[PDB]
Design a binder for these strands. Structure first.
Ligand SMILES: [K+]
Ligand SMILES: [K+]
Ligand SMILES: [Mg+2]
Ligand SMILES: [Mg+2]
Ligand SMILES: [Mg+2]
Ligand SMILES: [Mg+2]
Length: 92
RNA sequence: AGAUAGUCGUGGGUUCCCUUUCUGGAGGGAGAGGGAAUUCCACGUUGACCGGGGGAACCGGCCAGGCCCGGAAGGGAGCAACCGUGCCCGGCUAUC
């Protein structure tokens, strides 16, 4: 799906950003104790009106295991966005 | 012509896992701190040097392929191979 997003205030989220067992392996923020399922996630994104649209047929290089990828709207910066999602994920 | 043994300190490098600031359409970019290693560099330090050889899938570094993101460039996690080490042989010197 190329780079359009750039023009849509979109940014790509590889699920690993959150649910990687090791940072070197991909996590960019504190580990999430609980375990989180895919659909649950999406859900949360939507919940923050990030209007997630998913992209199948896309393999993270640090684990070709994951074949999909989520497109989301930047809230302020990919960064802020993530914090926000993560922080939200740790919803007790 | 015997037995063994081959300096320690701080700084930094790197690597591993962790926490963290800013950031891009991916691979990612620019920083901060903590801990655990080090086979890697500083000088300073000590009698703690000199050569030789060698090869771990399961050690460390690195990584052809293959598996990936990229428009490409390139960037990645990573197996074999390679390297480095581990090891072995002398001398050299040290304590018995
Ligand atoms: K290897
Ligand atoms: K690499
Ligand atoms: Mg789109
Ligand atoms: Mg490595
Ligand atoms: Mg390759
Ligand atoms: Mg000897």
């Amino acid at each position: 799906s190329l780079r359009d997003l750039k023009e849509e205030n979109r940014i790509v989220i590889w699920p690993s950003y959150f649910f990687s067992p090791t940072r070197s392996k991909g996590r960019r923020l504190a580990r999430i104790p609980y375990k989180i399922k895919t659909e649950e996630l999406v859900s949360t994104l939507r919940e923050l009106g990030l209007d997630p649209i998913v992209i199948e047929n896309k393999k993270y290089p640090r684990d070709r295991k994951i074949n999909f990828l989520i497109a989301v709207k930047k809230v302020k910066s990919k960064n802020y966005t993530l914090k926000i999602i993560h922080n939200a994920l740790m919803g007790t």
